[PDB]
Structure 1
Amino acid sequence: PPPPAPQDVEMKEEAATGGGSTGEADGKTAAAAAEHSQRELDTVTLEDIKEGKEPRFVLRALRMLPSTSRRLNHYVLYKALLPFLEEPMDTEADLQFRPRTGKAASTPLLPEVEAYLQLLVVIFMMNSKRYKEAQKISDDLMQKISTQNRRALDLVAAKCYYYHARVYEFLDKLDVVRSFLHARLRTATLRHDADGQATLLNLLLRNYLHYSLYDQAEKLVSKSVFPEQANNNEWARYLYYTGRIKAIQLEYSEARRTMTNALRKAPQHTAVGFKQTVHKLLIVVELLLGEIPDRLQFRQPSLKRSLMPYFLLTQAVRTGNLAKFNQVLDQFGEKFQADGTYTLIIRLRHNVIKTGVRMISLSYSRISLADIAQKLQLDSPEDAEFIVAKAIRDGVIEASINHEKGYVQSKEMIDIYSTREPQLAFHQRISFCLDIHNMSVKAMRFP
């Protein structure tokens, strides 16, 4: 008695969404798609949520003259796989409705990802995407009829390339798909820019920081910026991956602002630990700064089972205990090697000394050297002059050593009062504000 209901509403899924998309895509260009055609993301993740089932919607696909009304109603009525996923090509070649080729080569095929048998149909999904990649290649050699693949099926295409990813990942890696991607880039570079490269580039970094390491420098020459960032979700996790990069490129002062940006551009919900687990390794760069506040302003108790190392670790950060250092290391270094954590163990001592020198430096105008050699667990006055020079290391607040015997003649620095440095920066503040005025201009330009 429940399955006759998706016979109605799962039918109206393709009726409303797909029928409106294809029919309203046949005209009214660029309102052809992208007013409910790329409702596709959540309505088709929902198709994989909202609801035997496997052969039914994949038989008898390409018929004739547009009788999909009757054919999808047959798919409704029939509720009472070896050539079956290829049967949308085996009834006849599709031969009409080229906006429907990728659509029916995505939406019926993909629910086996959520069926999870992983043994016989992932190679059949590989074959179904050999068909759909034959569409992808043959759109410019055999389909010289109209656009139908940029304005609708490019936004469909990047989605089903994430589904390519979902298929390719569950068994192996991909290498041929990378030059195949850059060919897809070349047929999206100058004509019509798609994300695409950034999709499999997120995957590139995701499997490469696991397994290849030359390619950040190849990103450097490959950094076509793509300032469109329309979803902002892909762009958010793009910033997450490259912030892991600059953490492993040991770039920290950039990392704090760009990863705080990457967090605040996540509007996400569902507190299973998505935002939380991404955010923990995000503010590992703040563990690497030398400065981090108490993480009470960051914890969701669903993350608590994973951060059972992490709270005691930030305790070790705020303290300086070598016992706590090594104990958190050996005991609580599990579950983070899967993410990669052991670059903080070399410089947790640096975190200690920068936290201490921050407290003491903003605390004290003048300090003495052979007592700042005993504020923290320092070693010697030669180690203390050493660590004063290493405490500068970049251009920190004025600390001149009293170069006879007066240990240090440091003082506080001034002229941040309200004089020229803020009005040196306010041109750029209002440069950002006029950029938002350009956003207002484009707000007017949206119709």
Structure 2
Amino acid sequence: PPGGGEQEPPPPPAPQDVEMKEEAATGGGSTGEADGKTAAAAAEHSQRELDTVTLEDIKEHVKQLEKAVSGKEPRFVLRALRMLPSTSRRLNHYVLYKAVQGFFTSNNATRDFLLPFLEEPMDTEADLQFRPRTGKAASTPLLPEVEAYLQLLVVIFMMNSKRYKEAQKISDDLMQKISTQNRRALDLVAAKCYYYHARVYEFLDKLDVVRSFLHARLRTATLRHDADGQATLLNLLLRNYLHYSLYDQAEKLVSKSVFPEQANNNEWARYLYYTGRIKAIQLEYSEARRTMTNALRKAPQHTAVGFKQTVHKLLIVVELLLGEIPDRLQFRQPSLKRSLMPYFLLTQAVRTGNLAKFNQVLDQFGEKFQADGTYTLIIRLRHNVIKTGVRMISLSYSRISLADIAQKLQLDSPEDAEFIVAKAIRDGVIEASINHEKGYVQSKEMIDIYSTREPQLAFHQRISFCLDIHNMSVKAMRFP
């Protein structure tokens, strides 16, 4: 109270006021946009959505006593909002419940009164007109309820709030859908509770009823129009099944649904991450890394968040299985410090022709290799180490014999050197030929590529792609 109690009066009043005004003028701005000119594609819906993910998750994590976030439920309990006198009477109430909670205290939350704060604000003459107002006021309790992390009769209050939200979600999507379409926010709101619906089960058990319902929402969506609902719902079905260390790879293979067509530059970044994992595990490496790159290079506007850490951690692994490897520690991070050392020690022993240091590093760093989430390195690297030597020699020597390459590759067998190169030519490591007469192994002959119909075909890729960059960028801008 002398030190800590004096800095108790400053935090409520103005953040109580200025956070309340911004969501009011947006919700009033969304309502007029819902009533007239539903073309709200470049409207304030997404930027308010980008506020709630960022600010309201870092501004507050507790239910904010002195009635700051805890006062939102006794404020919004008496809300009807049907007619023009009825709205003006409620606008009289909006002023009065802020003025009372600003001056004095009204109704306090003691981390247990979650059922009175969710059923009576849902009730009391509430209508199905102001749909984002209702969906926001149910989604905003879900954040401090999880961020409290007390786990004392809390899961059921999470669960009932989700089911009520889903009941309000189905009541929107089926009855009176005439020009409201709140799917642009409801997808993430569904995604946020499902992250909590996964995590709460992940504290205790698996999750499968969440996915059967997620099929059912995917069954009741995807017939209307793809409006970035199906995109995120495809990922939420996909993330758990990859997280399960059993199967469901073939379910994603037959999943003929790759057409989200837009992602707000948010989903397609991480959508291209997951399908890169699956093309990598299905031994299709060339298409994997080029879209693993396309995911990483898309959105670097992130200050050490972790998926950027994870795509970069995998991309260097699929590069090592191909054979080439550029620098990776050039953008060092305080989070990269515990991840830059094992892979750099890994790519050191791979590119060199050593084995005992390689096994020592493999024995030392296997605990991290399991904690990262790839196990196939144990089988796919011993092909790489034995082919790194033959690729470097075939790149260097134009014509090396088998008896020399057998002694150079510490092999002690001059009989399988024909078999290694025959595996190397078949697998596409290098284009050579074995003259099986005394052991002549030749290489390429011609270097002319220029007047031999190479350049035009790449050039036809450059023209057709950039005019498509052009015309899409033409249509995307002349909106007025």
| TM-score class, shorter | 0.7 to 0.9
Label 1:140 to 1:291 Cα distance change in 2 as closer, same or farther (>3 A): closer
- Report how far residue 428 of structure 1 moved: 2.2
Moved more, 159-168 or 287-296: 159-168
Question: Which residue of 8, 23, 31 maps to 2:32?
Answer: 23
Q: Residue 420 and residue 32 in structure 1: after superposition, are their counterparts in 2 closer, same or farther (change >3 A)?
A: closer
Q: C-alpha deviations, 1:338-362, integer Å up to 9, x for none?
A: 3333312223232223333332222
The 1:109/1:402 distance shift into structure 2, 3 A limit, reads closer
CA–CA distance in structure 2, aligned partners of residues 252 and 287 of structure 1: 11
Preserved CA contact (<8 Å) 1:401 1:407: yes
- In 1, the alpha carbon distance for the partners of 2:91 and 2:195 equals 26
- Deviation readout 1:55-91 (Å, 9 max, x if unpaired): 7667878898787898799789879993323332233
Q: How many equivalent pairs are there?
A: 447
Contact 1:10 1:50 in 2 (8 A): no
Write out per-residue CA displacement over residues 142-196 of structure 1, whole angstroms, 9 at most, x where no aligned residue. Answer: 4355444346656765666666556665555432333332332333323121333
> C-alpha distance in 1, partners of 2:133/2:22?
15
- When structure 1 is superposed on structure 2, of 215-224 and 330-339 the one drifting more is 215-224
Q: Distance in 1 between matches of 2:187 and 2:76?
A: 24
> Which secondary structure state, in structure 2, belongs to the residue aligned with residue 139 of structure 1?
helix
Q: More deviation in 333-342 or 310-319?
A: 333-342
1:122-201 equivalences in 2 (<5 Å): 122-143=155-176, 145-150=178-183, 153=186, 172-201=205-234
Would you say the 8 A contact 2:27–2:132 is kept in 1?
no
Query: How big is the shift at 1:388?
Result: 0.6
Residue deviations 1:301-356 (CA, integer Å, cap 9, x gap): 53121333222111111223221222122211112213333312223232223333
| Counterpart selection for 1:6 from 7, 10, 15 | 15
Alpha-carbon distance in structure 1 between the residues aligned to 2:284 and 2:410: 27
In structure 2, do the counterparts of structure 1 residues 348 and 55 end up closer, same or farther at CA, with 3 Å as the change threshold?
farther
Report if aligned partners of 1:252, 1:285 keep a CA contact under 8 Å in 2: yes
Give 1:284 deviation, angstroms. 1.4
Q: 1:331 to 1:88 in 2, by over 3 A?
A: same
Contact 2:242 2:248 in 1 (8 A): no
Task: Summarize the Cα distance change of 1:435–1:309 in structure 2 as closer, same or farther, 3 Å threshold.
Answer: same
SS at match of 1:309: helix
CA RMSD of aligned residues (A): 3.6
Q: Is the 8 A contact 1:105 1:132 kept in 2?
A: yes
Task: Between 426-435 and 59-68, report the one with greater CA deviation.
Answer: 59-68
How far has the Cα of 1:23 moved from its partner?
2.7
Q: 1:24, 1:33 within 8 Å by CA — same for their partners in 2?
A: no
Kept in 2, the 8 Å contact 1:162–1:199? The answer is no
| Bigger mean CA deviation after superposition, 138-147 or 112-121 | 138-147
TM-aligned CA distance change 1:357 to 1:238, over 3 Å: same
* C-alpha contact (below 8 Å) 2:34/2:179 kept by paired residues: no
* Identical counterparts, % of pairs: 100
1:178-235 Cα shifts (integer Å, max 9, x gaps): 3332332333323121333443433333322332654332223323222423233322
Stretch deviating more after TM superposition (62-71 or 250-259) = 62-71
Call closer, same or farther: CA 1:133–1:117 in 2, change over 3 Å: same
* Partner deviation per Cα, 1:352-400 (whole Å, 9 max, x = no partner): 2333333222222212222222333334222211111111124454311
Deviations 1:34-64 (Å, cap 9, x if unpaired)? 4345531334531233337787667878898
CA contact (8 A) 2:231 2:260 kept: no
Determine if contact 2:432/2:442 at 8 Å carries over to the other structure: yes
- 1:408 is paired with a residue of what secondary structure? strand
1:239 touches 1:262 (CA, 8 Å); kept in 2?
A: yes
Question: Which whole-Å deviations, capped at 9, do the CAs of 1:104-157 have from their partners, x for residues lacking one?
Answer: 222344332333334433321211121111122223544355444346656765
2:396 and 2:146 mapped to 1: Cα distance?
A: 58
Q: Is 1:366–1:409's contact at 8 Å kept on the other side of the alignment? A: yes
1:263 and 1:140 map into 2 onto residues whose CA distance is 35
The residue matched to 2:174 in structure 1 has which SS?
coil
Cα separation, 1, equivalents of 2:368 and 2:330: 23
- Return 5+ residue gaps in structure 1 as ranges: none
Label 1:367 to 1:57 Cα distance change in 2 as closer, same or farther (>3 A): farther
1:168–1:174: 8 Å Cα contact kept in structure 2? yes
Structure 1 residues 70 and 179: alpha-carbon distance in aligned structure 2, compared to 1, 3 A threshold:
same
Question: Which piece of structure 1 moves more, 257-266 or 327-336?
Answer: 327-336
* Structure 2: distance between partners of 1:78 and 1:122: 30
Distance 1:218 1:349, change over 3 A: closer
- C-alpha contact 2:304 2:335 (8 A) present in aligned 1: yes
Any gaps of 5 or more consecutive residues in structure 2? Answer: 1-9, 61-70, 101-114
Task: Provide the C-alpha distance between the structure 1 equivalents of 2:88 and 2:187, rounded to a whole number of angstroms.
Answer: 26
Alignment counterpart, residue 240 of structure 1, candidates 254, 268, 273: 273
Seen in structure 2, the aligned counterparts of structure 1 residues 415 and 119 have a Cα distance that, compared at 3 Å, is farther
Aligned residue in 1 for 2:355: 322
Question: What SS does structure 2 have at the residue aligned with 1:365?
Answer: strand
Q: CA deviation at 1:263?
A: 0.6
Alpha-carbon deviation of 1:259?
0.6
**Structure 1 residues 29 and 144: alpha-carbon distance in aligned structure 2, compared to 1, 3 A threshold:** closer
Distance 1:169 1:76 in 2: 43
Q: 1:141 to 1:440 in 2, by over 3 A?
A: closer
**Rounded Cα–Cα distance in structure 2 between residues aligned with 1:316 and 1:356:** 12
Q: Is the 8 A contact 2:218 2:233 kept in 1?
A: no
Give secondary structure in 2 for the equivalent of 1:401: strand
